[PDB]
Amino acid sequence: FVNQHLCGSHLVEALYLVCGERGFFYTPKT
Amino acid sequence: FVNQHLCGSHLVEALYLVCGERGFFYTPK
Amino acid sequence: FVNQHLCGSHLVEALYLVCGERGFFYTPKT
Amino acid sequence: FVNQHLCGSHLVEALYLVCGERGFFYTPK
Amino acid sequence: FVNQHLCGSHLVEALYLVCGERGFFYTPK
Amino acid sequence: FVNQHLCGSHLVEALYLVCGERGFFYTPKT
Amino acid sequence: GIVEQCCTSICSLYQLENYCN
Amino acid sequence: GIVEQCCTSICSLYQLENYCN
Amino acid sequence: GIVEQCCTSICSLYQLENYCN
Amino acid sequence: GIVEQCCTSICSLYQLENYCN
Amino acid sequence: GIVEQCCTSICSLYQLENYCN
Amino acid sequence: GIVEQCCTSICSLYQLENYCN
Ligand SMILES: [Cl-]
Ligand SMILES: [Cl-]
Ligand SMILES: [Cl-]
Ligand SMILES: [Cl-]
Ligand SMILES: [Cl-]
Ligand SMILES: [Cl-]
Ligand SMILES: [Cl-]
Ligand SMILES: [Cl-]
Ligand SMILES: [Zn+2]
Ligand SMILES: [Zn+2]
Ligand SMILES: [Zn+2]
Ligand SMILES: [Zn+2]
Ligand SMILES: [Zn+2]
Ligand SMILES: [Zn+2]
Ligand SMILES: [Zn+2]
Ligand SMILES: [Zn+2]
Ligand SMILES: [Zn+2]
Ligand SMILES: [Zn+2]
Ligand SMILES: [Zn+2]
């Protein structure tokens, strides 16, 4: 898997792929 | 019939823009 | 809605979402 | 039958690349 | 029936993330 | 066509568009 | 859920906002 | 329009260029 | 133009909407 | 190929990895 | 949070998975 | 390679096409 900085929409896309049917949460202010 | 996998990919990008700093949970099922 | 810099393809995607059935124009040299 | 909403999202990204500094109008309807 | 053109666009972005520095060949046909 | 730097996923998307049915190869370590 | 509402029909920005935190 | 031409069939780069300014 | 307003500076949702048809 | 396997069905990360170099 | 871990720093696949439900 | 040509430097359309199969 890539080893790089993931921000914004690219981070969200990576979560979508990694998490599959489980879904995910994107909380940028945490 | 819409492709759920492709739709979801699109939806989370739209939520990124709409939600901004509030963030979101993506719960497909 | 996000409050951030939007450039290139990310700007175009944001317009697509915001503008809906109305469509939009992307004129970068203006 | 193609999903127009998803197709359009894709199309505008392709126009960004193809049109470059010329830009484009996206008029779906 | 899945839209092959839209599916492929999605797939290559997923391969970018999964493959990382190894890269990949995308051979649809 | 754009004349700009294309990296990562944006580079891959550009190849997908440019290459069509031919496909392409993305070898970042070459 | 969001898939049931926003995949079959196009959700406006306002409808998408329901899913935000 | 572009949706009628380029959603049902795949438009080449050359066909997409019609829609540029 | 849009680049000056939204790319090198930041556009509010209302400002992005100025580029809709 | 990848289109036959991963367009009709969703490929997991592990299945996608087959296509890497 | 995810920004500190994965955006200003780098997340391994295992670390990205910490944000799945 | 493609990174040196198109990411740290700029590729023309013709140069991007060198990476097609
Ligand atoms: Cl995915
Ligand atoms: Cl949407
Ligand atoms: Cl970017
Ligand atoms: Cl949208
Ligand atoms: Cl799609
Ligand atoms: Cl296209
Ligand atoms: Cl996938
Ligand atoms: Cl394309
Ligand atoms: Zn980085
Ligand atoms: Zn996927
Ligand atoms: Zn910024
Ligand atoms: Zn980007
Ligand atoms: Zn949308
Ligand atoms: Zn899509
Ligand atoms: Zn640049
Ligand atoms: Zn395309
Ligand atoms: Zn700023
Ligand atoms: Zn770093
Ligand atoms: Zn440069």
Swiss-Prot record, chains A, C, F:
Substitution effect: R22Q: In MODY10; reduces binding affinity to INSR; reduces biological activity; reduces folding properties
Result of changing F24S: In HPRI; Los-Angeles
Protein's UniProt name: Insulin B chain
Native source organism of the sequence: Homo sapiens (Human)
Curated annotation (Swiss-Prot), chains B, D, E:
Effect of H10D: In HPRI; Providence
Domain of life the protein comes from: Eukaryota
Protein name in UniProt: Insulin B chain
Species of origin: Homo sapiens
Organism placement in taxonomy: Eukaryota, Metazoa, Chordata, Craniata, Vertebrata
Gene that produces this protein: INS
